[PDB]
């Protein structure tokens, strides 16, 4: 699902996160920055798990409550 890069939101890791499922989730260290690509799940459903792109370049899902949106 597309979007205007220009209203893109960024986030910061509040805590370390270890992927229980490396195929669907990405790792985070407190403090890391990432771009929120989508807040839906792989099925377009609302989700407490969001798809993001981190600094190292990995794409995947992280727990919404482990991050803070920068505004």
């Amino acid at each position: 699902e597309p979007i205007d890069p220009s209203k893109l939101e960024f986030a910061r890791a509040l805590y370390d996160f270890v992927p229980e499922n490396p195929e669907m989730e990405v790792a985070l260290k407190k403090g890391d920055l990432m771009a929120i690509l989508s807040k839906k799940d792989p099925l377009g459903r609302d989700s407490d798990w969001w798809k993001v792109r981190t600094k190292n370049g990995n794409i995947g899902y992280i727990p919404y409550n482990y991050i803070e949106i920068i505004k």
Binding site: N21, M24, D48, W49, Y61, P63, N65
Partner: peptide, 10 residues
């Protein structure tokens, strides 16, 4: 000290 993880569907 780490927040509870939200339920995931996979």
């Amino acid at each position: 000290m780490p927040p509870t993880l939200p339920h995931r569907d996979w």
